[PDB]
Structure formats: C-alpha cells, structure tokens
Amino acid sequence: IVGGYTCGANTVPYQVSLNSGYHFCGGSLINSQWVVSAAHCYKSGIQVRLGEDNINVVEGNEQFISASKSIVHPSYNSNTLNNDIMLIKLKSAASLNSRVASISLPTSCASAGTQCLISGWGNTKSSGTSYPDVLKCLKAPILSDSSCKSAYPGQITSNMFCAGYLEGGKDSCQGDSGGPVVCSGKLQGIVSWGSGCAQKNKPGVYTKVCNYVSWIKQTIASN
Ligand SMILES: [Ca+2]
Secondary structure, X not given: OEOOEEOXXXXXXXXXXXXXXXXXXXXXXXXXXXXXXXXXXXXXOOEEEEOOOOOOOOOOOOEEEEEEEEEEOOOOEOOOOEOOOEEEEEOOOOOOOOOOOOOEOOOOOOOOOOEEEEEEOOOOOOOOOOOOOOOEEEEEEEOOHHHHHHHOOOOOOOOEEEEOOOOOOOEOOOOOOOOEEEEOOEEEXXXXXXXXXXXXXXXXXXXXXXXXXHHHHHHHOOO
16 A cells, blocks of 8 residues: 555454465455455465464464465456456354454445555555555545546456546555455455556556445355
8 A cells, every 4th residue: 555554453454464474455244154355366375364464473363374275266367357256164163353354245236436455565656565464554535437548548447446536646455456445334345456556547456346246245155
C-alpha cells in the first residue's frame, strides 16, 4: 500500500497473509473454512496466516492453517486478468474471535464514489521498494467505469473496477495482490492489477467480487 497508514493490530480481522515460506499475497476470510484471494496469486503449498499484524514476529494472536484446496475461477484468464479470483479452503476451521473474523460477501455491487478500505503487506513505495512488516491500510474511492476504461483502454471488463486517485500518490501495490477491498462492510474487490503503483492516471484495478457470489456460494456448497 503506497500512501496509506498503519491499520492497527487486528483491526482488519478478515485480512489474511498467504505464505509459501514468505508472505506473497493477501486474502480475505469469508467464513471459518474459506479464503477469497486473486487467481494470479496461485501457488502450490500455501499456508494461510490469520490474526497477523507484524508478519515477521509472532505476537500471539496468529492462526497458521495449511490450505487443503485451492480453486482458481474456471474462466480465469492470466493474459487479461479477467476473472482474477480464487478460493482457498483451510485444512481446519479457523477459531473465530475478536481478531480473526469473516467478512460478508456482497448482495449488491458497490456504488461508484464509495470510499472503501484496501489493506495489505505490499510495497509502500511508488518509486522503489519497501515492504512493511505491519499491516497497512488505505481509504480509496471506487472510480467510475468510464474513468477506469479511459485509463486502461481495451483492458477493463465488466468483472473489474478501478479505485484510487488519478493524481497519483495513493494505491495498492505488489504484495497487496489478493487482499481485500471492503466497501460498506462487504468484500467488493480483490487487489488485482494496475500499471505501476500510485502513478498519475493509472489507478488500481480490482476484481469485482459481486459478479462472483453465485460461483462462490456453489463452490463452497460443494467442497
Ligand atoms: Ca505475526
């Protein structure tokens, strides 16, 4: 997250870190057994880390749970990042508490202009590289579809939305991928892509989770 703030330990209790020997992507706990992330974050051998603040220190509220299954969307296209969503099943149910909690899925899609909370352990520099140890947060508005298409002509599908600040300076970034965009208490986006981070006229692009609720529900009913 570039231009964000320190969230505060466990104040984003649905935020997970996906670990394969190191943090590589975020995700969102949607119930005791299931995490939503980005398909482009797929790796074999994922351990889901819940209750994290500093990902390099055991602070006492973590639950580390292996993935048993990962399910990339049937129509994910890594070339265009269309359908950039994945489900991860945990080997055992998380113990839900004040610091480890699920986030609601949407019923309706989010409105343009809504201020959402984006969070992660990704790079905090727009030019160069610095990865934070503690969880970072950013408040960012959903941009209009017209504005998003203008920014990335020929590349925005109906399953994507833009959010952030066209003047630059505030965005998600590498390493935030797969983590949440929460709007009115619902998981409305997944950190997906963008040209660079926090660059002028290049806002972040996010998977539009409300297009996937029927797939999420039937997949979890079946696995
Ligand atoms: Ca920790």
